[PDB]
Structure formats: C-alpha cells, structure tokens
Design a protein around this nucleic acid. Sequence first.
RNA 1: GAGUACGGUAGAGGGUGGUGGAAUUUCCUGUGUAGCGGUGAAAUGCGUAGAUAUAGGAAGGAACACCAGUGGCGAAGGCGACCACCUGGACUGAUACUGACACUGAGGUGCGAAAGCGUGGGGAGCAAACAGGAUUAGAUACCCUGGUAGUCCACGCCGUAAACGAUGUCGACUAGCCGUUGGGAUCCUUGAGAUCUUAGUGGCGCAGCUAACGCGAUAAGUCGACCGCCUGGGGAGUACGGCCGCAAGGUUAAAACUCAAAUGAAUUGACGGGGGCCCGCACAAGCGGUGGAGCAUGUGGUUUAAUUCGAAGCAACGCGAAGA
Lengths: 118, 55, 153
Amino acid sequence: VKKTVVDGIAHIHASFNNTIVTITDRQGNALSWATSGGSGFRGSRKSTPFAAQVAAERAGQAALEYGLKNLDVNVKGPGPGRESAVRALNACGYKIASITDVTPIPHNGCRPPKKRRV
Amino acid sequence: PAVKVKENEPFDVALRRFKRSCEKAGVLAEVRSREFYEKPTAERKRKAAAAVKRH
Amino acid sequence: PRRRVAAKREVLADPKYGSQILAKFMNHVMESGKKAVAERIVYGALDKVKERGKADPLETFEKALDAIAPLVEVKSRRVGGATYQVPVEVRPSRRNALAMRWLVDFARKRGEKSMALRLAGELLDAAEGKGAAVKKREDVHRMAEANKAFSHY
RNA sequence: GAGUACGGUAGAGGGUGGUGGAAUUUCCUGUGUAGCGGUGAAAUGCGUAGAUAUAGGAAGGAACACCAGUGGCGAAGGCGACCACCUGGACUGAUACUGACACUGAGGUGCGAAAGCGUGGGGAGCAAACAGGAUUAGAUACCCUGGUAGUCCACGCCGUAAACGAUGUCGACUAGCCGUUGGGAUCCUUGAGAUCUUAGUGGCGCAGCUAACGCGAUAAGUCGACCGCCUGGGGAGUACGGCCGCAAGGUUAAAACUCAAAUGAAUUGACGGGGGCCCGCACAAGCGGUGGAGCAUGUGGUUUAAUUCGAAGCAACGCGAAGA
C-alpha cells in the first residue's frame, strides 16, 4: 500500500561486478530496490555505469508510489556507477539533500584474500 | 566523503564537489589497496620504491 | 598507421535536375563505369516516381534519403582486451553516402522487373518509411540503444 | 682507550595485565522482493523455506586505517592502537672518580623469521591438503566457489632462510656538496633563521681501488689486531659414521666416477605474449574477386616405354618455355 513517506534515504551498493540501489526511510525500512543485473545487463554489461543508472532509474520510479520527494544519498563501495546511479536519481523527480560515501574502511582488521595470479 | 546540497545551485556542481571530497579523503584508493592482501615483503618493496621516487 | 589527408574529390551536378545530390546517387548505382547506362535508370526511375503521385521526383529523393540515413552506428573497438561495439554518431558526409548505399543494394535484390522501376519502387517505398532499407536503418538503430553501456569514444 | 657517579632526551626495545574504534563473520528481529555472488565470459555456490540490500541488537576472534617518514629502537631474528606496572640499552652536558681495567676470539654458551612438531586452549578472516566449477588436446595448476591443518594464546621443541648491505668485529687517517632523526654550543635573545659539533640515517662526488659493474668518512681507499671461510664444474652439502632432535630433520662431512670446462662483468647483434615514437591496401571504410560451376595453363601424385630436366613458403606452381 501507500506508506506515505516524505523523507527517504537512497543506498547504492556499487561494486566492481554489480550495483544495487535501495530506497529506504530515515529508519532503514526498505521500499523499493533494483540492481544492474536485474535490468537485463548480464556479464560485461552488469559492470558498466549505464547499467547502474538504469537500476537507479528503475528503483527511482518504483519509489514515487510512496509519495517520496526528499531523500539522502548513501553511496557505498567502489565501482563503475557510484556516481552514475546518483545522476539517475536527479533525472526522475527528486531533490538530494546530501550525498555521503559510506564505504567501509577497516582499520587494518581482517586479512583480505590473496593476490590473484591472473 | 559527505557533502550537503545548499539552496539555489544546480545539482551538477553538487556532484563535482562530492567527488572532490572523495579524492580528498581518498576512499577509492583505500578500498583498492585492501582488495587483496599485500605481503610485508611486497609492501616494504613498494614503499622503498616510493621513497626513491620522492628523492 | 597513416599520415595522409586522403583526397577531396568533387562531383559535378546532374544535367537534367541541377542537383549534385543525385550525382552521388548516380555515382553510387554505378556498375563497370557505364555512366550513360546508369543515368538512364534514375531518370526513368524519377519519371516513374513523378508519374505515380508526388509533384517533383527530386524532392521525394530528399525525403527518401533522410528516412534511410542512420543517426548512429557502432564500430568494433578494442580497449580492455575485448571488443566493445561503441555506438558513434554518423557524420553528415557519411550518412547520406550510406543512405545512397542501402537504397540501391536492397532494391537490387527486389523481385520487380528491372532496376529502372526497382530503385523507383523503393524510392516511394522508402520515402513513407516502410521499406527494407528503412527496415535496415532501424535494426542498425536497434544495434545501438542496446550497446549504450559503452560510451567511451 | 675502557668504565663509573649526576641531570635530561627520543624511541614499534622487551615482558605482564587491562581498555578502545573501524571492519569482517555468525546468529536474532523489522522492512522488502527476484535475484545475489563470481568471472574475460561462465559455472559450482547462495536464494521464493524470502537471499543480497537496508535498519536495530548480540557473540566472538584477529590485526591495529589516518599519523607513517631511504623515520625510530634492537646484537641479529625483529618490534607499529591506547594506558598502567616491571625492565634493558642508546644519545646528550659538565664536573667528579678508577687508571689500560682493552680488542678479538678456536672450543663453549645464549638468542634466533616463517614453516613445522608436542600438550592444552581458541578460532572471525585468510588458507597448504581436500572437494566441486571452469579453461585446456590434457590441467593433479593459474581463475571461481567452499574448506581442514595452520595462522592466534601459554608452556616446551626445532635451529633453518636470498637469516642479504650476498660486505665479520674493533681502532686510526683521507676533498667536498645536498637532505633527514635525537641532542649540544654560538650568532638572533629575535618573533625566528643562520654557523659549528656529535651519535645515527640517505643521495651525488675529487682522489684512491676495482675485471667491470660500482664503492667512495655508513669504503669495496691507506693501514693495524684477531677470527671465520675458499682452492675447477658435476657427483654433493650427498653417502657413511658421530653429536643433537619426538619427528621432520639439523650439524660435522667424503670417495669412486665423469667433464674440459662451469663462472663473473661488460660489448655488438638478435629476440620479448617489455616500453616510447613513426610508416606501408598492414589494419579500418568501401570497389571487385578467389575458394562453389564449366573451360585454359602449370605443379604434386599416379601410370607409362618415356610420361625429358630444372624451379619448391612468402621469394616454385600461365616458372626456364617470347608459343612439343
């Protein structure tokens, strides 16, 4: 149904292989989500900024049915589409109050995997 | 890594300030370095070359 | 690699209509350098177009080529060790030339009696936008707008 | 020379206990719905039993982002979160004191990365082995998905590394120039720089040395004390014996035989699935073709009595032959 939420938060889980955009409220209750791999982009096209904005635009219009006009952008992770997905949120009806990078940074914690000997 | 959009400016220049904040913090470089584990020999060998280039 | 500026060839206007746009159309439909034979085709084709509707065979040529000339086209391109068909816009010098390309090629493979009425058959069949040359234009446009992911040059 | 007494300075020097933040994983709950994850692309895998994402909470282990620096400390191996306790050394200033008490060092003894071994704990991530998915002619690999020992802690053992500066320790002397760390002295008392001096830590460089590369006050230069080690390559740091070890193994350490060379540095060329620049119907865009069909020609093969001989990738095959 219509939750009638006016203030939201947009999360872009941009990675080197896929970009997941999720629109949520100020308390972290998700409403709509879309991914680059879920928009017909598979393989080499899933890791392209154009696929990222298609995911952001697809989830963008699915989020207006809640009557959402204000949101804060929480982009996280590296990859081709950290910014291209945010520019998609501007094309559809929205105003961005703030843009924040929430990419997790270990303070030299858990050991990462080994170098790929490609 | 955090910018606030002000009144009466285009959202385009809000983006350019955003990544300018990002490279100032250097978050992309940090996540690139933590992608895989660099052994202490490879890390010390990289820093030794960094000192040579600087001088 | 090359450093040459290639060459700038000029085409003189047609003697029966005073339009250099038909000159390169004549230049395109050529076979074995037979200038006199081929120009008999277009004028007979233009008479057929003029005799069947319209008011001027020259203006429907103008109407025909824009419906054939694409506005975008991909090209094979290797950057990251793989082939990325980057869609690129077609320059004005090339779009009309390739428009003249696809009109004759698909009319040559038609089932009508002679080319004199076969290019003429496509001319109105392409001016309204329901011909095979029109069909070939959109699938090229279909080739792009799907590879839009690759936009780096 | 060596050492002691005093004030001070810097430090990831070492040991024993606490404490913190970021992050990962696992679990619980809410929202929410078709993917997530991965790759060159896939697939194994995870997911409609509701995954990933997002928010709140909890547990647990490991390492301490930024600071961070040819920076610092340490005999070396090594040592990076913070704090408290215990503790070694170095540097620095003057005065005071002993008065050669020094250097080196076969044996000997102590410490000694990582892996490994034993007993007991612990276990988040990573990951030998192992399993599956790919790739490949094959792939006991590279890549992906998982994953055990191990990595962590305590107490023992091992005693080896490209344990390297491939450069033993100690002392003296020999142009300079440019940085940097901890001090000291004088000009600047400057507010704030400059000049000497010392202990380190780097980059050039005269002389000198070097086979050359290069070293060049942190010498591989000029010397002196002592010690260790080498005598062509392979066999071989192997066998045998001794000592050590729980083991894996370590250490000491040959010969027969065999070869006429192995080797270091540097030069020219060539090559590179190294880099930079440039050109050619080399590529790109098109024009028309061959390869499919019939005929002409030559060649290989076959056959023949001979099917005369030569030409054999580009650069032989309508070539010598401009005509059996």
